[PDB]
Design a protein around this ligand. Structure first.
Ligand code: PM8
Ligand code: ZN
Ligand code: ZN
Ligand code: ZN
Ligand code: ZN
Ligand code: ZN
Ligand code: ZN
Ligand code: ZN
Length: 77
């Protein structure tokens, strides 16, 4: 499978949203309805899957599904 597929699956699982709703342009807060706690738990779930650590101040600025995919392609090793 692809990174896009793996990342979207975790986002849908974490936020309780259906797959067809997890588009690449979608914003986590406005479009997918992520709340304060969701922000924290979603960041940690992806950090674990992709064995990486993102700085909280940088995570806070990753607003869309595609921005999250982009960060993982750039930092996963
Ligand atoms: P709550 O009211 O206490 O907190 C609400 C607010 C103040 C909105 C905070 O969530 C906050 O800091 N908001 C800043 C603007 C905003 O909505 N930013 C967040 C978008 S969602 C998010 O942070 C999830 C990112 C997931 C992708 C990261 C994956 C990287 C893994 C390596
Ligand atoms: Zn594959
Ligand atoms: Zn596939
Ligand atoms: Zn929905
Ligand atoms: Zn949008
Ligand atoms: Zn909640
Ligand atoms: Zn953190
Ligand atoms: Zn690795």
């Amino acid at each position: 499978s692809t990174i896009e597929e793996r990342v979207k699956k975790i986002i849908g699982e974490q936020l309780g949203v259906k797959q067809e709703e997890v588009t690449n342009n979608a914003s986590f807060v406005e479009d997918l309805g992520a709340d304060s706690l969701d922000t924290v738990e979603l960041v940690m779930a992806l950090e674990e899957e992709f064995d990486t650590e993102i700085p909280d101040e940088e995570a806070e600025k990753i607003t869309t599904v595609q921005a999250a995919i982009d960060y993982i392609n750039g930092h996963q090793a």
